[PDB]
Amino acid sequence: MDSQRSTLVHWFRKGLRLHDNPALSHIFTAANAAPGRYFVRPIFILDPGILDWMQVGANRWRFLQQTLEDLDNQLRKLNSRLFVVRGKPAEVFPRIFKSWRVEMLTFETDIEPYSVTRDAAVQKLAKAEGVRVETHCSHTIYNPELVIAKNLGKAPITYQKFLGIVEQLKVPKVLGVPEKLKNMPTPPKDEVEQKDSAAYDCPTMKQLVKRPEELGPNKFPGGETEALRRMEESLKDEIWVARFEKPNTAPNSLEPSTTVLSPYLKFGCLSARLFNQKLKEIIKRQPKHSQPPVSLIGQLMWREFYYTVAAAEPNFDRMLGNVYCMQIPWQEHPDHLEAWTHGRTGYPFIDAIMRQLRQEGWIHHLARHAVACFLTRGDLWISWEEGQRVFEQLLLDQDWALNAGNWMWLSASAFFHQYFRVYSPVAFGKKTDPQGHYIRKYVPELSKYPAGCIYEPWKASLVDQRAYGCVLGTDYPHRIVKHEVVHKENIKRMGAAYKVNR
Ligand SMILES: Cc1cc2nc3c(=O)[nH]c(=O)nc-3n(C[C@H](O)[C@H](O)[C@H](O)COP(=O)(O)OP(=O)(O)OC[C@H]3O[C@@H](n4cnc5c(N)ncnc54)[C@H](O)[C@@H]3O)c2cc1C
């Protein structure tokens, strides 16, 4: 096979998987249809210039490193490989369109504003250069543009309305893995590979993680292979799956009470469409089962809902200019923001959650509720954008639409408006962890406190605090605010802001 004329490119960004990947599958099918004509290059473009951006924490870089290694491993089973191309797309694509004689480029669509801008520019260049582009909406179960169209041009702004719309939509088909490449030699080295054969090899941990001191325990390895193993593990207890009720899962069990598939769904290591289809099979054969919103399918529909409102608002992650967002006069509080950011608020439940987040990169949904309420309307009266920023740095599952949507909910800025309901930083965790095992783990300086005061260590006398080895103001901070006072003030501030907006 000396005969090749062109290269077929799949561009990974999200969609970091072989299964249920129509953009990738179509490349491999086209290659096999015309033996001898094509080379195939599945690529991921890594801009070294952002390895130092503090908004990507080490834990999330490590998850990507592991994911790319797995993706490359899996593509090798198809007689292909991953090509990790270092550079910026604005410079990479002109070069490789010419160098590789690219005939077709496929990718999975992404709704985030810079991605839309970037992809429109790649698409314009491709059209000019005669490159056929095919894009697929496989990151979400439904295409937000069809949802918005079915709703007469507006995104549904309640969960029940959204369910009412998507009930009327066809469910896109879930694909298997692509065909193994037949009769295809490896691509000839381009000018970059000619100088360094390894130029497109998967990055090492050292190449990707510039701040290894931020790494915590490796609890959730990256990659499709782990994503599928973890999904199958969650699905094997079919009664647990069928009867799942999200509000009844604990925020502070030591091991996660929910699936922790969110890092996998965020990177596309797991297809949400596959997972939806598997859940539907379970629900159909388990006559006793939960329903949306609280069921596991309901959780995937939460993700769908936020992707659809976000698709219609480029400013979804900001207060100003955001069609959904109440304008609320959040205050600047640098010292309180720093304390919340580092889990030094003096409320042990809140601090344990922020410390788990920083160390491990995942915290349960209702743990996110507790700390987000505390930062914003509940206690510190700081903008939800500041909380979004910190979550963006530390979460493995950092997701532009899901982070912004849930921060607006928790701050009573959109989608949720019952701001008289406020989480108690002392009482909320006790329902599910009365001994405080979660605090003893993540705030180890309090680990000797009796369970009767570990949520509220200021209730222990100085002599008791000394006996427990941890004196407030010396070994663990005093409360930075007093919840019982400030949350009442903030309920009045929320009332005022709601009036101004009305
Ligand atoms: C302030 C705040 C910020 C959040 N930021 C993110 C984020 O950046 N990325 C993210 O993936 N989720 C985010 N969430 C939503 C949710 O808390 C996580 O999706 C969930 O904790 C992931 O754990 P799990 O995989 O065990 O979820 P499960 O309960 O097992 O749910 C399965 C999947 O459904 C989806 N899902 C579940 N709950 C929600 C929800 N409330 N909204 C949207 N999708 C949901 C996720 O893809 C999740 O993996 C945020 C929530 C809050 C309150």
Residue numbers in the entry: 1 to 502
How did the manuscript describe this experimental structure?
The photoreceptor protein uses near-UV and visible light (300–500 nm) as an energy source to monomerize (6–4)TT [or (6–4)CC] lesions in DNA.
Indeed, the mean r.m.s.d. calculated on the main-chain residues is 0.35 Å, which indicates that the position of the main chains was unchanged. We conclude that the FAD is in a fully oxidized state in both of our structures. We therefore estimated the average diffraction-weighted X-ray dose during data acquisition to be approximately 3.2 MGy, which is a moderate dose in crystallography.
